[PDB]
Nucleic acid binder design. Structure first.
Ligand SMILES: [Zn+2]
Ligand SMILES: [Zn+2]
Lengths: 178, 286, 113, 286, 178, 113
DNA sequence: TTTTTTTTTTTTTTTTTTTTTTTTTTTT
């Protein structure tokens, strides 16, 4: 399998809780304040500064601002090529893995490309739609968790209300983190 | 035979064709013009069995031989007919010199007579429209293809010519193959583009791609290795681009679902925003 | 640790005293190619945009991200990013700005752990 | 603004800072350590207007934003910079987050700020490259010079020290002077080399030259006479050598055109042959 | 002034017409078969014999061969030092004044120095280039001389065609010699 | 008056019967340190060079100026001058030899007094 | 309608000294 890249506001990534998987092959993920488990991030913003390419070409990075937050986007080794593509002022869409370095969340670039201003508008519309969809589902799942917890009975009730079983585990994990 | 009309497929062996059907419709015989300039006759009927319907096309002497003998409600048995794809994508039975029809046969069968999210996609899905982000680039390469069937052509060193297994000695055309992944926020799917569609997305000519593949192969890489390398080194810029792909989903026995894209196009942002507004209205926002 | 403050989306007429970095979207009405300044009209007001290197064209629709400069001559924007918003559906943008204004505070306030 | 660099003072209101200057010097970007332990970048330039010079210090993101965009001879406009006192008591412009720079501004103050044959050379010529034969050796001598400005230093017998009129009490270095002629087949020009360039061509140390000059002076010759004699007696071997000289041409009020060579180098024979091939092609040979 | 040293084949010097200036201060010069007025010569060849230094050190001489001719190079009094510098077999570049002794042209050494084999190649390339340049200019100047001679009208025509006024005088002088 | 005949530039394969003093350029392939002889290969042939005192090294590129000796044992060159041509651009030398061959006779023939 | 076939995954980051240019003739 290959899980989805979740379209989010930079603020939601920044305020999230990064989870480092102990296994050498397990993917790292983030749990947002609204109990959203995110493996990959899909953001749309403006490149605010001319990229930073290390002289030794070991890493390349660029900054993206979407209005709700500012995040760094990093490409290592030959992946430095991604940072060379962009320039200060470009309006871009970024997909990648969420990483945490020095307790600051960032995006490990998988892809970056220039977008039309209407794509930024489409991004804002989709981000808000998905956010409302998720919050309403998580609110019902939280009530199920507070009443029954993670039991075989609660899993059946969650499926009946259109809630994935994984959502109850995310709530429990978030409660454990907080 | 137990064969049903639902089992017919275009290009199936005429020797296997053995179906029965009751006549639902008979259209008037018509004239048609042959490649040699002469005029022939052709007549069509619609028949059906317990499984589905088929157009039956009587050609030339088969019209004189059978057309007046058949009537609506009669059952016919069709043998040795060629199966073609109709203008609506459905099987049709062509009754040419080789074919036979049995009127009211003695046969046991006689008594029996779109926008989709990746999370919802299934194997064998047809005419699916998916809007998403290019997430990965697997391979970029070009191969010599037949200009008619677009299949891989073989170079014969003994004769110095290019041979297509279906069309013989042909002049080869360079066909571009683009394998990538697409993400829509609810799922991930592999995508393959061919020729003109792939060249349009890549923004590089197939002759230029062939030259770059040759340089990589000369360095000690196989065709497989050179195709993956060119995708990562030169066509990584395509990643992160939002596009709309349309195609059919085939299931590979290890690679999983592969979307064979017939076409790709740029996102119509107003159309997409209207879809989102519909979803917001359903959530009680507007 | 002065982390980069995200550009706050505003209309020219709604700029606040506490705002230090803003995002404005309008049409260019005048370009001074000697003092590197241009006049941006968004429908709600006109802002004088001081640019360092990129000067737009007259009549071009542009999005400007800049730092606000408050002096005795008035309030001018020192442009950091100037983007071509010529084919942008400002009607759709205005509609999403209103949707975010209404729904974002309600979504945050729904959290009853 | 009418503001000039001469009007800047440390601690002046950055809102009043509005100056223009042409870039005279650019130094390499450097790293510096912050109070929090992190490492930043800093780069310095020297600019000047019709009134004076100022160091311009680009900090952190301002280096990435402007440093590569600026070049010597370009004019910049500086706004909202902090003014600090340099280590020599002079104003410096600090380009931090608040400050702005306009490259090649539209401002009224701005207006107020190669291989050549000897036959084509003119007085005051700058950056001229001439390839020719050493034809004559006028004078070879060494003088005591200041290590900073390279000007002649005076020995004070009362204090026993060496005095530079610009830097005061200094430790003198021996500076070699080589005056010779160069011929390219189309003309003749006088050439002067200094210090390390002259020592490299002569293949003798300045201390050894000073000793030979002393021996000649002791015999009853003046400094002028000894310099001409050493050139003819010991450095005549350099005549007939083909070299490439680069420098500026100054016109002496009686000696004529003198090429003050900044550098000399050996002839690149393949480069020279290619120039000749270009000329032959123009004549209709190839 | 100080006129240029012309790069030539030894053959062109040997076949030339030496002109002795009657004035005690006027420089001697040579006029080649292609009407080239030469005050100084610049040649590149091999020293074919061990130098000849007179026992009394009054003169020193050495022989240079370039493939097109063989010429003697002479240094007198202290100038004998030039001949002491070289040895049999050295590939050298020589600059000096053309002299004629016993109706044989020779070079009065002004400078001699060892050269890299690629300098000999560069010399051959330059010598041929200059020769073609000169011949074509002298051919046009000869036509002007045969039609008009040395008149104010011919001098204007010569300047228009990129020919120096001195070239017409050289042609007239060469015709007088022959 | 036997004036010194200038060394005629030739390739080993182009040596003529009437040639008495020649200039050859090649690579040393064998050195006999007892008979003071060496084998020179220019690409067009191999010549046996008899030297009086200077013996080159094997593999060294050298230019030889010598008198031709014609005897019953063959044609050998009695070397007069042996120069180190190790850093010499023989490609450029070959190109100038062809330019001189073509243009020198034409330049001499242009004289119509 | 096509080529050729093994999907995904972690971690790595600071401007000079001092002043008169060039030229003939002499040879075992
Ligand atoms: Zn075919
Ligand atoms: Zn000093």
């Amino acid at each position: 399998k290959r899980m989805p890249a979740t379209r989010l506001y930079i603020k939601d990534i920044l305020e999230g809780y990064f989870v480092k998987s102990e296994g050498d092959f397990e993917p790292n993920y983030l749990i947002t304040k609204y109990a959203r488990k995110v493996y990959r991030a899909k953001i749309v913003g403006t490149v605010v500064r001319e990229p930073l390419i290390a002289e030794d070409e070991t890493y390349g990075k660029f900054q993206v601002d979407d209005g709700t937050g500012v995040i760094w986007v990093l490409g290592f080794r030959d992946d430095t090529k991604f940072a060379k593509l962009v320039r200060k002022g470009d309006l871009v869409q970024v997909i990648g893995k969420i990483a945490e370095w020095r307790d600051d969340k960032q995006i490990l670039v998988e892809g970056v490309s220039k977008v039309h201003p209407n794509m930024w508008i489409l991004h804002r519309y989709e981000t808000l739609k998905e956010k409302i969809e998720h919050i309403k589902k998580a609110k019902i799942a939280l009530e199920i968790y507070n009443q029954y917890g993670i039991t075989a009975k609660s899993k059946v009730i969650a499926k009946n209300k259109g809630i994935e079983e994984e959502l109850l585990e995310v709530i429990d994990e978030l409660y454990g983190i907080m | 035979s137990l064969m049903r009309i639902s089992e017919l497929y275009p290009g199936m062996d005429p020797r296997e064709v053995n179906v029965v059907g009751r006549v639902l419709k008979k259209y008037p015989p018509r004239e048609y013009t042959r490649k040699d300039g002469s005029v022939g006759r052709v007549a069509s009927l619609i028949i059906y069995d317990d499984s589905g319907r088929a157009r039956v096309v009587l050609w030339d002497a088969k019209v004189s031989e059978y057309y007046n003998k058949i009537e609506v409600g009669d059952v016919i048995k069709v043998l040795d007919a060629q199966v073609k794809e109709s203008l609506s994508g459905l099987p049709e039975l062509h009754i040419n010199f080789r074919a036979r029809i049995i009127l009211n046969p003695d046969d046991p069968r006689v008594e029996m007579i779109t926008r989709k999210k990746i999370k919802d996609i299934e194997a064998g899905d047809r005419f699916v429209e998916v809007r998403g982000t290019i997430a990965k680039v697997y391979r970029v390469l070009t191969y010599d293809a037949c200009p008619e069937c677009k299949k891989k052509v073989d170079y014969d060193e003994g004769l110095g010519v290019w041979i297509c297994p279906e069309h013989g000695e042909v002049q080869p055309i360079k066909m571009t193959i683009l394998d990538f992944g697409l993400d829509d926020g609810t799922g991930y799917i592999r995508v393959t583009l061919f020729g003109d569609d792939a060249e349009e997305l890549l923004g590089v000519s197939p002759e230029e791609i062939a030259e770059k593949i040759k340089e990589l192969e000369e360095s000690g890489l196989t065709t497989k290795e050179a195709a993956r390398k060119l995708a990562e080194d030169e066509f990584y810029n395509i990643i992160g681009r939002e596009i709309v792909v349309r195609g059919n989903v085939i299931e590979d026995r290890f690679l999983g679902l592969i979307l064979r894209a017939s076409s790709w196009e740029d996102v119509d942002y107003r159309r997409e925003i209207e879809r989102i507004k519909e979803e917001l209205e359903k959530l009680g926002v507007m | 640790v002065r982390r980069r403050k995200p550009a706050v989306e505003r209309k020219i007429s709604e700029i606040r005293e506490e705002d230090t970095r803003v995002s404005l979207i309008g049409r260019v009405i005048k370009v001074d190619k000697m003092d590197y300044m241009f006049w941006l009209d968004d429908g709600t007001g006109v802002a004088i945009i001081e640019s360092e290197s990129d000067l737009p064209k007259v009549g071009q629709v542009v999005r400007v991200i800049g730092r606000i400069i408050r002096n005795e001559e008035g309030i001018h924007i020192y442009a950091e990013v100037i983007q071509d918003f010529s084919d942008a559906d400002l009607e759709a943008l205005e509609e999403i700005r209103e949707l975010e204004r209404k729904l974002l505070p309600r979504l945050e306030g729904e959290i009853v752990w």
